[PDB]
Amino acid sequence: SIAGITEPTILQYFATLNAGEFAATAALFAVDGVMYPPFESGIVGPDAIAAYLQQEAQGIKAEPQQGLAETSEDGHTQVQVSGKAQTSWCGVNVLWLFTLNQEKQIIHTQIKLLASPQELLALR
C-alpha cells in the first residue's frame, strides 16, 4: 500500500510489477494505453509494455512511498506516486504519473526519474 493512495489499479500495478508478473501489470492498461519510460519514447499496448517491463525492470524493486490523486473534469482519474526504484548497487528517485479511464484501465503512465550521477550510467 501507498500513503494517500487507495486506488486498487495503482496498488496492483506495483504489486504485480514487484512479483515479475509483467503481462499482468501490462493487462492493467487499455489495449492502446501508453507507457512513457525515462529513456525511450512511448511504448504502446500490453505486449510491447510487458516486453519492456520484463526486459528492463528485471532486478529492480519499485518502492512507492506516497501519492496524490485527482479527478479531472473529463472523468479520468489522475494519480501521482513518488518513491524509489532500487537495486543492490544503485537506485533512483521516481515520480510515477498515472491516468486512468472511467473503467479503471491505465490510459497512460509516465515515469520521471528525479536525476543524479548514478542515473547517468543507465543502460537505457
Numbering used by the authors: 15 to 138
What text comes from the article?
OCP is a water-soluble, carotenoid-binding, 35 kDa protein found to induce dissipation of phycobilisome excitation energy minimizing energy flux toward the reaction centers. Unlike the wide variety of HCPs, the CTD homologs (CTDH) fall only into two clades, of which only one is present in Anabaena (a clade 2 CTDH). Recently, it was revealed that isolated CTD of Synechocystis OCP and CTDHs from Anabaena and Thermosynechococcus elongatus (a clade 1 CTDH) are also capable of carotenoid binding. Both CTD and CTDH were shown to mediate carotenoid transfer to apo-OCP, apo-NTD, or apo-HCP (from clade 4). Thus one likely role of CTDHs is to serve as intermediate transfer molecules required for delivery of carotenoids from membranes to the HCPs.
In order to obtain a more homogeneous preparation of apo-AnaCTDH dimers, we added 2 M urea to the solution, which caused a large proportion of the high oligomeric states to disassemble, resulting in predominantly dimeric CTDH (solid line). Crystals were obtained in the presence of urea. The asymmetric unit dimer (hence called A-type or back-to-back) was formed via an interaction plane between the β-sheets of two monomers, quite distant from Cys103. PISA suggested that only the F-type dimer has biological significance, (ΔiGP value of 0.067 for the F-type dimer interface). The presence of the disulfide bond forces the formation of the F-type dimer of apo-AnaCTDH. The most striking difference between the apo-AnaCTDH structure presented here and the CTD-OCPO structure is a major shift in the position of the C-terminal tail. In contrast, in the apo-AnaCTDH structure, the C-terminal tail adopts an internal position, coming closer to the F-type interface between the CTDH monomers (CTD-NTD interface in OCP), partially covering the opening of the designated carotenoid-accommodating cavity in the apo-AnaCTDH structure. Owing to the steric constraints, the F-type crystallographic apo-AnaCTDH dimer is not capable of performing carotenoid uptake from the membranes, as the carotenoid channel is partially blocked by the C-terminal tail and filled with the Cys103-containing loop (hereafter β5/β6 loop), while in the A-type dimer, the carotenoid cavity is open. Thus the F-type dimer cannot accommodate the carotenoid unless structural changes occur.
